[PDB]
């Protein structure tokens, strides 16, 4: 972008909304590409500030969610804190 | 990258695995930023080619999945085909 932004909540409602729409499409596009390049199945569930639901699935949301329910094994699970910890691990 | 790649399945297993790891982290990082910038709660469920589960949630996976189950309103729903159609609409 024109400038480096800090990762911190956007207060201007319009900006936030503008950013949200663009970055959500951004995110869905990266998910499509991951799902095709590496033959994986992906589901994505987003609730905005207004608790409105936006969803994406590579192929079929219900198929992925059910396979999720059938999963019976320790797996990789990450949160924002993991990401943030990993970003100190990197840097420059 | 050094070269523009086509979005199509990667045949070399190592490359695919290498791509998978990097792009998944990429995807989770974009989701972290979206969730912080725009005060969103996000869940992400990925099954690789080997049907192994990788999950991310901004805060707590079970909280998001339950709020999902409670949702009863028509909302935005996207698939790979939507994304692909949206890209053909605008190349420039």
């Amino acid at each position: 972008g024109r400038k480096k932004i800090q990762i911190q909540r956007i207060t201007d409602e319009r900006n936030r909304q503008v950013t949200f729409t663009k970055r959500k499409f951004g995110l869905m596009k990266k998910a499509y590409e991951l799902s095709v390049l590496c033959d994986c199945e992906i589901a994505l569930i987003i609730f905005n500030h207004s608790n409105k639901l936006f969803q994406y699935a590579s192929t079929d949301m219900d198929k992925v969610l059910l396979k999720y329910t059938e999963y019976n094994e320790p797996h990789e699970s990450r949160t924002n804190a993991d990401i943030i910890e990993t970003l100190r691990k990197k840097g420059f | 990258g050094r070269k523009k790649i086509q979005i199509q399945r990667i045949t070399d297993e190592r490359n695919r695995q290498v791509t998978f790891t990097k792009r998944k982290f990429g995807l989770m990082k974009k989701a972290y930023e979206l969730s912080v910038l725009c005060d969103c709660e996000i869940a992400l469920i990925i099954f690789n080619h080997s049907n192994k589960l990788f999950q991310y949630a901004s805060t707590d996976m079970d909280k998001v999945l339950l709020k999902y189950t409670e949702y009863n309103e028509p909302h935005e729903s996207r698939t790979n085909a939507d994304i692909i159609e949206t890209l053909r609409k605008k190349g420039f």
């Binding site: 329910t69 | 999902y68 189950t69």
Partner: peptide, 14 residues
């Protein structure tokens, strides 16, 4: 519908 039902059914019971 029934999938939403099944999801909540398994997250609960944990």
């Amino acid at each position: 519908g029934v999938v939403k039902q099944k999801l909540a059914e398994v997250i609960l019971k944990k």
